[PDB]
Every structure is written in C-alpha cells, then in structure tokens.
Ligand binder design. Structure first.
Ligand code: HEC
Ligand code: HEC
Lengths: 82, 82
C-alpha cells in the first residue's frame, strides 16, 4: 500500500504529524486565534472551501473540493480543538 | 460526515496537524534521530507494529494492527521525511 494511505487508514494521524511545522497552521493555534471572534465557523468554512492567503504567512491555502456542509463540519471541528 | 474522516479524506493532512505537539514524535524528528543508525527501518517497523515505550517520554505507543509489510512500508516512509 502507499504509505501516506496507511498513515491515514491505520490511525497514526491521531498521534503524529510529519513535522512540528507543517505548511499550514496547526488547528489548536487556529482555534485559539479565533477565541474572541463570533462567526469564526462561517469564516473558516469559507476559507477551507475557497482557499485563503496572507493570514498566517505568504504560503497560500488552495481551494478544497468540499461541500458547504463538509466545510462547516471541518470548521466546527477545527474550532473544537483543545 | 465525521470531521476526522473528512480531515483525512479531503487532503488536509498534507498541510496541517492538530497541534505542533502531538502525543508522539514528529516523523521528521524521528528520521533525524536515526540518521547514524543502520537498521532503523527494521527497528521502526517493529515499534510501529508492536508498540513501544520510553524512547521519547513516558507516553506509550500502543501496538498497531498492521502487517509486517505495512509496518515496513510505514517505517521506510517515516525515514523518508526531509
Ligand atoms: C500508525 C501505524 C503509526 C505509526 C506509523 C507510528 N505510530 Fe507512534 N508513537 C506514539 C508515541 C507516544 C510514541 C513515543 C513512544 C516512546 O516514547 O517510546 C510513538 C513513537 C513512534 C515512532 C518512533 C519510535 C522510536 O522508537 O523512535 C514511530 C516511527 C511511530 N510512532 C510511528 C503514539 C502513537 C499513537 C497514540 C495513541 C498512535 C495511534 C501511533 N503512535 C501510531 C503510529
Ligand atoms: C482540508 C480540507 C483542509 C482544512 C480543513 C484546512 N486546510 Fe489549510 N491552510 C494552508 C495554509 C498554507 C494556510 C494558511 C493560509 C494563510 O496564511 O492565509 C491554511 C489555513 C487554514 C486554516 C486557517 C484559516 C485562517 O484564516 O485562519 C484552516 C482552518 C485550514 N487551513 C483548514 C495549507 C493547506 C494545504 C496545503 C497545500 C491544504 C491541502 C489545506 N490547507 C487543506 C485544508
């Protein structure tokens, strides 16, 4: 099997990242940054779906092929990180 | 859909972790630690399959339900992190 496929399928993602510094911000840090903002869930869902740039650094996030509902589910989950 | 399921299925894992500090060591750090050791791939495959404890801290890694071949594939990939 492809190893990235196994990494996801075999539960490793719960406990490990490739790097302490991934290209995008860690979700716990995203959650903390938004702690004083209402409407974080809607904003993040839009960013997740459509892509975004310039908030955390010069590296863009491309759009993601997710539905509105999927984007909202993911935004809520990012915001649920403790 | 479950959000952890979407996180894996929609490609987010390539660019984000939940936390800069996951319970287990980051794979780039594992790769660097083993740079002077022959037989790292076999050692890591065994750790991945069987679990391990006490190398990085007090939190154990439980066994993972992987085949020998899957464990080797994953060990090789961990070691391929740059
Ligand atoms: C899913 C199959 C994987 C893969 C590929 C790896 N793990 Fe873990 N892991 C966890 C912890 C707490 C540790 C440190 C244990 C200690 O201090 O001894 C590890 C360690 C590793 C390593 C490095 C092993 C070494 O001896 O250097 C590697 C390569 C590794 N893991 C890969 C914690 C977890 C989990 C928490 C519940 C889960 C799930 C996994 N690991 C799963 C995987
Ligand atoms: C898969 C569907 C996901 C999810 C759920 C998220 N991303 Fe990304 N992301 C990346 C980068 C470089 C950034 C920073 C962009 C900037 O500086 O503006 C982001 C940002 C985010 C956020 C925070 C958005 C904010 O405005 O604060 C969130 C919640 C987020 N992402 C979730 C990089 C990548 C990728 C690299 C190629 C990929 C793939 C994804 N992101 C995918 C996802």
């Amino acid at each position: 099997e492809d190893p990235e496929v196994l990494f996801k399928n075999k539960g490793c993602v719960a406990c490990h990242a490739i790097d302490t510094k991934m290209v995008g911000p860690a979700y716990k840090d995203v959650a903390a940054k938004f702690a004083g903002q209402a409407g974080a869930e809607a904003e993040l869902a839009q960013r997740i779906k459509n892509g975004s740039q310039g908030v955390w650094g010069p590296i863009p996030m491309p759009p993601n092929a997710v539905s509105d509902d999927e984007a909202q589910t993911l935004a809520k989950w990012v915001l649920s990180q403790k």
